[PDB]
Design an enzyme around this catalytic site. Structure first.
Site, PDB file in Angstrom:
ATOM      1  N   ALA A  12       0.825  -1.200   0.000  1.00  0.00           N
ATOM      2  CA  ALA A  12       0.000   0.000   0.000  1.00  0.00           C
ATOM      3  C   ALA A  12       0.863   1.256   0.000  1.00  0.00           C
ATOM      4  O   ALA A  12       0.627   2.182  -0.778  1.00  0.00           O
ATOM      5  CB  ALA A  12      -0.944  -0.003   1.203  1.00  0.00           C
ATOM      6  N   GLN A  15       2.646   1.613  -3.479  1.00  0.00           N
ATOM      7  CA  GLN A  15       1.777   1.965  -4.600  1.00  0.00           C
ATOM      8  C   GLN A  15       1.201   3.366  -4.435  1.00  0.00           C
ATOM      9  O   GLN A  15       1.093   4.115  -5.412  1.00  0.00           O
ATOM     10  CB  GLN A  15       0.669   0.923  -4.746  1.00  0.00           C
ATOM     11  CG  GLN A  15       1.196  -0.436  -5.183  1.00  0.00           C
ATOM     12  CD  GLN A  15       0.107  -1.441  -5.512  1.00  0.00           C
ATOM     13  OE1 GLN A  15       0.314  -2.345  -6.320  1.00  0.00           O
ATOM     14  NE2 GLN A  15      -1.053  -1.298  -4.880  1.00  0.00           N
ATOM     15  N   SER A 140       0.285   0.761   5.146  1.00  0.00           N
ATOM     16  CA  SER A 140      -1.025   0.274   5.549  1.00  0.00           C
ATOM     17  C   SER A 140      -1.018  -0.099   7.029  1.00  0.00           C
ATOM     18  O   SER A 140       0.029  -0.335   7.634  1.00  0.00           O
ATOM     19  CB  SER A 140      -1.448  -0.937   4.719  1.00  0.00           C
ATOM     20  OG  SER A 140      -0.613  -2.058   4.979  1.00  0.00           O
ATOM     21  N   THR A 145       3.975  -6.235   6.539  1.00  0.00           N
ATOM     22  CA  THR A 145       5.073  -5.290   6.376  1.00  0.00           C
ATOM     23  C   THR A 145       4.645  -3.886   6.790  1.00  0.00           C
ATOM     24  O   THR A 145       5.294  -3.247   7.622  1.00  0.00           O
ATOM     25  CB  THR A 145       5.551  -5.296   4.926  1.00  0.00           C
ATOM     26  OG1 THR A 145       5.890  -6.628   4.536  1.00  0.00           O
ATOM     27  CG2 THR A 145       6.765  -4.394   4.746  1.00  0.00           C
ATOM     28  N   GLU A 183      -6.244  -8.287   9.897  1.00  0.00           N
ATOM     29  CA  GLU A 183      -5.906  -6.872   9.784  1.00  0.00           C
ATOM     30  C   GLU A 183      -6.253  -6.065  11.031  1.00  0.00           C
ATOM     31  O   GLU A 183      -5.504  -5.123  11.337  1.00  0.00           O
ATOM     32  CB  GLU A 183      -6.572  -6.283   8.527  1.00  0.00           C
ATOM     33  CG  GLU A 183      -5.925  -6.803   7.245  1.00  0.00           C
ATOM     34  CD  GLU A 183      -6.355  -6.068   5.993  1.00  0.00           C
ATOM     35  OE1 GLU A 183      -6.793  -4.907   6.092  1.00  0.00           O
ATOM     36  OE2 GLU A 183      -6.244  -6.658   4.899  1.00  0.00           O
ATOM     37  N   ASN A 228      -5.829   4.991  -5.280  1.00  0.00           N
ATOM     38  CA  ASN A 228      -4.554   5.641  -5.010  1.00  0.00           C
ATOM     39  C   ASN A 228      -4.441   6.992  -5.693  1.00  0.00           C
ATOM     40  O   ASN A 228      -3.819   7.906  -5.143  1.00  0.00           O
ATOM     41  CB  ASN A 228      -3.407   4.724  -5.436  1.00  0.00           C
ATOM     42  CG  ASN A 228      -3.305   3.496  -4.568  1.00  0.00           C
ATOM     43  OD1 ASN A 228      -3.920   3.430  -3.501  1.00  0.00           O
ATOM     44  ND2 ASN A 228      -2.529   2.512  -5.009  1.00  0.00           N
ATOM     45  N   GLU A 254       5.372  22.667  12.057  1.00  0.00           N
ATOM     46  CA  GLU A 254       4.163  23.477  12.136  1.00  0.00           C
ATOM     47  C   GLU A 254       2.907  22.619  12.052  1.00  0.00           C
ATOM     48  O   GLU A 254       1.854  23.014  12.565  1.00  0.00           O
ATOM     49  CB  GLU A 254       4.168  24.532  11.034  1.00  0.00           C
ATOM     50  CG  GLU A 254       3.317  25.745  11.362  1.00  0.00           C
ATOM     51  CD  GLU A 254       3.159  26.690  10.189  1.00  0.00           C
ATOM     52  OE1 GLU A 254       4.113  26.817   9.390  1.00  0.00           O
ATOM     53  OE2 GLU A 254       2.070  27.297  10.064  1.00  0.00           O
TER      54      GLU A 254
HETATM   55  N1  LIG Z   1      -5.482   2.375  -0.684  1.00  0.00           N
HETATM   56  C1  LIG Z   1      -4.733   1.310  -0.938  1.00  0.00           C
HETATM   57  N2  LIG Z   1      -4.757   0.242  -0.073  1.00  0.00           N
HETATM   58  C2  LIG Z   1      -3.996  -0.847  -0.322  1.00  0.00           C
HETATM   59  C3  LIG Z   1      -3.178  -0.915  -1.436  1.00  0.00           C
HETATM   60  N3  LIG Z   1      -2.548  -2.118  -1.412  1.00  0.00           N
HETATM   61  C4  LIG Z   1      -2.946  -2.797  -0.308  1.00  0.00           C
HETATM   62  N4  LIG Z   1      -3.854  -2.024   0.358  1.00  0.00           N
HETATM   63  C5  LIG Z   1      -4.534  -2.304   1.616  1.00  0.00           C
HETATM   64  O1  LIG Z   1      -3.498  -2.552   2.565  1.00  0.00           O
HETATM   65  C6  LIG Z   1      -3.850  -3.635   3.410  1.00  0.00           C
HETATM   66  C7  LIG Z   1      -2.913  -4.806   3.171  1.00  0.00           C
HETATM   67  O2  LIG Z   1      -1.582  -4.417   3.411  1.00  0.00           O
HETATM   68  P1  LIG Z   1      -0.450  -4.504   2.275  1.00  0.00           P
HETATM   69  O3  LIG Z   1       0.255  -3.180   2.143  1.00  0.00           O
HETATM   70  O4  LIG Z   1      -1.047  -4.942   0.961  1.00  0.00           O
HETATM   71  O5  LIG Z   1       0.555  -5.655   2.798  1.00  0.00           O
HETATM   72  P2  LIG Z   1       2.118  -5.434   3.075  1.00  0.00           P
HETATM   73  O6  LIG Z   1       2.359  -4.095   3.725  1.00  0.00           O
HETATM   74  O7  LIG Z   1       2.928  -5.568   1.816  1.00  0.00           O
HETATM   75  O8  LIG Z   1       2.498  -6.580   4.130  1.00  0.00           O
HETATM   76  P3  LIG Z   1       2.537  -8.143   3.715  1.00  0.00           P
HETATM   77  O9  LIG Z   1       2.048  -8.286   2.298  1.00  0.00           O
HETATM   78  O10 LIG Z   1       1.681  -8.944   4.649  1.00  0.00           O
HETATM   79  O11 LIG Z   1       3.964  -8.611   3.819  1.00  0.00           O
HETATM   80  C8  LIG Z   1      -5.293  -3.968   3.071  1.00  0.00           C
HETATM   81  O12 LIG Z   1      -6.136  -3.211   3.903  1.00  0.00           O
HETATM   82  C9  LIG Z   1      -5.448  -3.521   1.623  1.00  0.00           C
HETATM   83  O13 LIG Z   1      -6.773  -3.200   1.310  1.00  0.00           O
HETATM   84  C10 LIG Z   1      -3.151   0.160  -2.314  1.00  0.00           C
HETATM   85  O14 LIG Z   1      -2.435   0.130  -3.316  1.00  0.00           O
HETATM   86  N5  LIG Z   1      -3.931   1.270  -2.061  1.00  0.00           N
HETATM   87 MG   LIG Z   2       2.923  -7.303   0.572  1.00  0.00          MG
END
Ligand SMILES: Nc1nc2c(ncn2[C@@H]2O[C@H](COP(=O)(O)OP(=O)(O)OP(=O)(O)O)[C@@H](O)[C@H]2O)c(=O)[nH]1
Ligand SMILES: [Mg+2]
Ligand SMILES: Nc1nc2c(ncn2[C@@H]2O[C@H](COP(=O)(O)OP(=O)(O)O)[C@@H](O)[C@H]2O)c(=O)[nH]1
Ligand SMILES: COc1ccc(CCc2nc3ccccc3s2)cc1O
Lengths: 437, 431, 155
Positions: A12, A15, A140, A145, A183, A228, A254
């Site tokens: 997350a 991206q 996220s 991670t 989560e 995004n 600030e």
């Molecule tokens: N807004 C948004 N949410 C995202 C995106 N990718 C994943 N998520 C959200 O992030 C959460 C999952 O965490 P991730 O970031 O995909 O997982 P990670 O941080 O790579 O950790 P692991 O994959 O478990 O090793 C969920 O709530 C998803 O809906 C994104 O590109 N945009």
């Molecule tokens: Mg991941």
């Protein structure tokens, strides 16, 4: 300068970071290869965008950005996409094995293998700074991670950069767009361990962004790219004061002064208007009064909650575009006279205003229409505690049975940390109750 | 994590294993010589999960073939894809296991297990980032059950940080060679509860009932049952072998599907249910796909899901279809069946969708349930185990291999504890 | 002692040793430590010819071991159809109850021996007979979801 370093952790964060830096480049007139024709400084430079971009001898403007994931898939796309040449290649860091949606793997068993490389690479960026002010961290709540490695990184950054500010952009989980049952566990664990290391954290509720894409942009099934690009539009609104000349929120310090009265309740609510579909290119242009009024409708909030059920401690309005200051003042007056928005009794009951007179940028490829004026309202309202309560309840339902706990205890974590984290959240909810009643 | 090491043990394990490899080889465009001949690049993107790349654009299953009797070698080699396996990965003994768990676990199998681990070790060393192991075997025999569980224990101790997953086929009097199968299965279930992270329960009682009553096959053969097994194994591994957005792997599946370490026995399902060379399944829509998928008649375990509660569920839809329609059908099933999903695990039903459908079908769905109703399967084996054990029938075949009689009472005790665990979470309330 | 040798010969299926041992006076109704007779053991291990031989030379078709198991119990449990019918032909008690309350019908139902189930029914197996948990054979078929067995039991 007074430089800022952006750190992106997990899918997350990476991206969203991609979309943010795409937008930044367009706002500043920077090509995907780093070249910038508009403003001609040979090297280095001290313009306002230099807070976020260093400059090489050859005129290349390079994000002060680090991307980290524990598996390579998402960062490999950055290494092969449009902006492959934009970033420092050494600032795109990946392991081979992700956290499997497990905070404990991201923080302990898997994150420990890469934390020292990430910090040495961050140090390399810091050493190029004449006046580093701190960090913006994107991640996220629900990822292994994003939750576990971020908390570990924030802990180490506090030791290594004691005086620097740290700002979070955090994706709050939604059932409509989720990836893991656990989560709520990861969200509570990371909030607990990051709370004392973060000065200001902007939560982005994936359900709120999902709602906006469906109702305002007429997208039946929003993709992460849809989400995004909207998120990045709002992040850019919040960071533009750091990247342009301005009089409100000119440095990371600030943000805390204007938005965070007490260090623990440091979770401002963002509201953004207007959000108009790109198919409605010839829409009537909304006035300052209208977009300002829209900042007090819950439909435009980044976190689902009800500010009418709460009290305000701070309120900033960040306008972009064709915005005359006198029209802002008239619009504010209308808000206080007609709206029942209650401030706590110990804060200045006034609104801070910043105006960037450049029209908002929209990415070619996006779903957002060009608008002549836009506004992001940052407010610290006790109502955001409703979001903590929803998360805590999902946590409580599973923890009462100890469901999935064994996956965390099996990865270098003690069961005692679940109740420690939960009681810290209980204390946070009481903090909001004591401030507003 | 990417690479999986596959092991097939015993007659059943090698028969369903061979079917697995000829099914996914076809989905990935791999011919019986290991050469790629596909028309989509998605077939190669994640090929390394199950295949080692060879010298000249040739692909070799990361599969180890094991049995204590040589007869299953020849048959597998005689098969359509028999020549694709690495000949050095055939590890077979001379004298079989005689349908005796003790021979497989303690005598004949203990002599051969070290030879098998040498091949496993080799295959693991060439992995960029091994994610875990997958075993196919039956529990009612001696090799797949006795030597299979021994292999699992030894692999568990050498690769403790890796995922261990099994496709375990449960015995049934409807498809039975001997009445000692409940012995062999109960002893194995004891090992499985302790040493695997995820087990797919393929119940021969369910497979026979599907073929006989639903497919109207008057006399089902092993090829009929294995038709269903290969379709199920293809479906549940779809998300490991093709990209998608889920980035699925064995550990993420386990973390999200297994709320309690011992309750890791999955009930798989599939829709449509077809027989070999029928082509009758044509007009199948998303509402029908979803209804059949949760229907007790489509379960590969002989258990009624509506006699228990789902702890977790994963649904894999394959083919081109309206994702808008899948989500509304999936939500529909959960709202009208709210009483069959536990309320204290929010968002416990996951939807995954894959572009590429299986052979012969354009629309298909695969179900993976962690349901407390699986206790009906273990109660069935337990009742048969107890009926035999109380009369001490054929016990000397096991004690005659150094096995102690208390090993039976401890296996019986462990399985009944497992049943009580399911019942405890079946009756637990949020409150 | 010829009795112990007859017990082992009957278990092992050594037809000729059974013939010679009985010719030398071996106790056809000898018992091992748990009360099993040669007929029990021949019925358990499927030795039809030894079953018939023992029954022709004074074997008690309804003898019980310490646990109340009759030869028919064991033949119905293991699934030896032809031995079941030889035993019934020689006067086996179709409704004998062992210490667990099980009848031959219970044991054939539990192990899924549907043809033996049918045979026992035609010979008057008690469909209302309950085990010590109160379950009849039909109860077992409902609890285990054995539809084929349940249909057979409703004639
Ligand atoms: N807004 C948004 N949410 C995202 C995106 N990718 C994943 N998520 C959200 O992030 C959460 C999952 O965490 P991730 O970031 O995909 O997982 P990670 O941080 O790579 O950790 P692991 O994959 O478990 O090793 C969920 O709530 C998803 O809906 C994104 O590109 N945009
Ligand atoms: Mg991941
Ligand atoms: N579904 C299925 N079950 C099988 C097959 N072969 C054997 N079995 C079952 O496996 C059990 C016997 O174990 P088996 O694998 O043959 O003995 P092993 O070689 O010692 O492991 C019985 O329950 C059989 O019904 C097969 O091809 N398909
Ligand atoms: C029950 O809720 C969930 C279940 C599973 C997952 C993710 C991982 C998966 N791995 C595989 C692998 C093969 C087939 C299907 C799947 S789903 C996320 C959830 O929220």
């Amino acid at each position: 300068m007074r430089e800022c370093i952006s750190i992106h952790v997990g899918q997350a964060g990476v991206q969203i970071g991609n979309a943010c830096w795409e937008l930044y480049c367009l706002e500043h007139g920077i090509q995907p290869d780093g070249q910038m024709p508009s403003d001609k400084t040979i090297g280095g430079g001290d313009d306002s965008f230099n807070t976020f971009f260093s400059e090489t001898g050859a005129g290349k403007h390079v994000p002060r950005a680090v991307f980290v994931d524990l598996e390579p898939t998402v960062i490999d796309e950055v290494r092969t996409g449009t902006y492959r040449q934009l970033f420092h290649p050494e600032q795109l860091i990946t392991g081979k094995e992700d956290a499997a949606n497990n905070y404990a793997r991201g923080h302990y068993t898997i994150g420990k293998e890469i934390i020292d490389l990430v910090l040495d690479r961050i140090r390399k960026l810091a050493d190029q700074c004449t006046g580093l002010q701190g960090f913006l961290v994107f991640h996220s709540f629900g990822g292994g991670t994003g939750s576990g490695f971020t908390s570990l990184l924030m802990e180490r950054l506090s030791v290594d950069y004691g005086k620097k500010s740290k700002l979070e952009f955090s994706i709050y989980p939604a059932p409509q767009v989720s990836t893991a049952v656990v989560e709520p566990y990861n969200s509570i664990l990371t909030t607990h361990t990051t709370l004392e290391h973060s000065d200001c954290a902007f939560m982005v509720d994936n359900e709120a962004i999902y709602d906006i894409c469906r109702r305002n942009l007429d997208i039946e099934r929003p993709t992460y790219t849809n989400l995004n690009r909207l998120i990045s539009q709002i992040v850019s609104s919040i960071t533009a004061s750091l990247r342009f000349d301005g009089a409100l929120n000119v440095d990371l310090t600030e943000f805390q002064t204007n938005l965070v009265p007490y260090p623990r309740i440091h979770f401002p609510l963002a509201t953004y208007a207007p959000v108009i579909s790109a198919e409605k290119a010839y829409h009537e242009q909304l006035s300052v009064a209208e977009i300002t009024n829209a900042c007090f409708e819950p439909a435009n909030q980044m976190v689902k909650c009800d500010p009418r059920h709460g009290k305000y401690m701070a309120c900033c309005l960040l306008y972009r575009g064709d915005v005359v200051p006198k029209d802002v003042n008239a619009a504010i007056a209308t808000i206080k006279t007609k709206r029942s928005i209650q401030f706590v009794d110990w804060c200045p009951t006034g609104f801070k205003v910043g105006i960037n007179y450049q029209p908002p940028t929209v990415v070619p490829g996006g779903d957002l229409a060009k608008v002549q004026r836009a506004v992001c309202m940052l407010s610290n309202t006790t109502a955001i505690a409703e979001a903590w309560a929803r998360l805590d309840h999902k946590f409580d339902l599973m923890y009462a049975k100890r469901a999935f706990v064994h996956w965390y205890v099996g990865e270098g974590m003690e069961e005692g940390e679940f109740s420690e984290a939960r009681e810290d959240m209980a204390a946070l909810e009481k903090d909001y109750e004591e401030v507003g009643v | 994590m990417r690479e999986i090491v596959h092991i097939q043990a015993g007659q059943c394990g090698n028969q369903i294993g061979a079917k697995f490899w000829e099914v996914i080889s076809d989905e990935h465009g791999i011919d019986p010589t290991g050469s790629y001949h596909g028309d989509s690049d998605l077939q190669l993107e994640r090929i390394n999960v199950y295949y080692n790349e060879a010298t000249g654009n040739k692909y070799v299953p990361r599969a180890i073939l094991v049995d204590l009797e040589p007869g299953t070698m020849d048959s597998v080699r005689s098969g359509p894809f028999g020549q694709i396996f690495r000949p050095d990965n055939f590890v077979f003994g001379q004298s079989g296991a005689g349908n005796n768990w003790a021979k497989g676990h303690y005598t004949e199998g203990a002599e051969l297990v070290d030879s098998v681990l040498d091949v496993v070790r080799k295959e693991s060393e060439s992995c960029d980032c091994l994610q875990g192991f997958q075993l196919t075997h039956s529990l009612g025999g001696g090799t797949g059950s006795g030597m299979g569980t021994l292999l699992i224990s030894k692999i568990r101790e050498e690769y403790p940080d890796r995922i261990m997953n099994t496709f375990s086929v449960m015995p049934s009097p409807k498809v039975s060679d001997t009445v000692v199968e409940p012995y062999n299965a109960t002893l194995s279930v004891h090992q499985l509860v302790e040493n695997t992270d995820e087990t797919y329960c393929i119940d021969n009682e369910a497979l026979y009932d599907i073929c006989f009553r639903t497919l109207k096959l008057t006399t089902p053969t092993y090829g009929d049952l294995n038709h269903l097994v290969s379709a199920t194994m293809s479906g549940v591994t779809t998300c490991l072998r093709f990209p998608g957005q889920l980035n699925a792997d064995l550990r993420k599946l386990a973390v999200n599907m297994v709320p309690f370490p011992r309750l890791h026995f999955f009930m798989p399902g599939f829709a449509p249910l077809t027989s070999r060379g029928s082509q009758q399944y044509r007009a199948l829509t998303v509402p029908e796909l979803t209804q059949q998928m949760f229907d007790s008649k489509n379960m590969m375990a002989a258990c009624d899901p509506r006699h228990g509660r789902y702890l977790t569920v994963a649904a894999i839809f394959r083919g081109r279809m309206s994702m808008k329609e899948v989500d509304e059908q999936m939500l529909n099933v959960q709202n009208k069946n709210s009483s069959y999903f536990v309320e204290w695990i929010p968002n416990n039903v996951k939807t995954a969708v894959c572009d590429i459908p299986p052979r012969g079908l354009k629309m298909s769905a695969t179900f993976i349930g962690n349901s407390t109703a699986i206790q009906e399967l273990f109660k069935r084996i337990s009742e048969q185990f107890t009926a035999m054990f109380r009369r001490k029938a054929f016990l000397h075949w096991y004690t005659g291999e150094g096995m102690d009689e208390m090993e039976f009472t401890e296996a019986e005790s462990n399985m009944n504890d497992l049943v009580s665990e399911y019942q405890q979470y079946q009756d637990a309330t949020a409150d | 002692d010829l009795g112990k040798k007859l017990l082992e010969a009957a278990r092992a299926g050594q037809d000729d040793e059974v013939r010679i041992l009985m010719a030398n006076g071996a106790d056809v109704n000898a018992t091992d430590a748990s009360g099993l007779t040669p007929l029990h053991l021949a019925a358990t291990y499927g030795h039809l010819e030894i079953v018939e031989v023992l029954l022709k030379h004074g074997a008690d078709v309804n003898a019980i071991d310490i646990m109340g198991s009759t030869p028919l119990h064991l033949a119905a449990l293991i699934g030896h159809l032809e031995i079941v019918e030889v035993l019934l032909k020689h006067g086996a008690d179709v409704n004998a109850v062992d210490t667990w309350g099980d009848t031959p019908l219970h044991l054939a139902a539990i192990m899924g021996h549907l043809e033996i189930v049918e045979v026992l029914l035609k010979h008057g197996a008690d469909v209302n007979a309950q085990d010590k948990f109160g379950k009849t054979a039909f109860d077992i078929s409902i609890d285990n979801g054995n539809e084929d067995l349940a249909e057979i039991l409703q004639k």
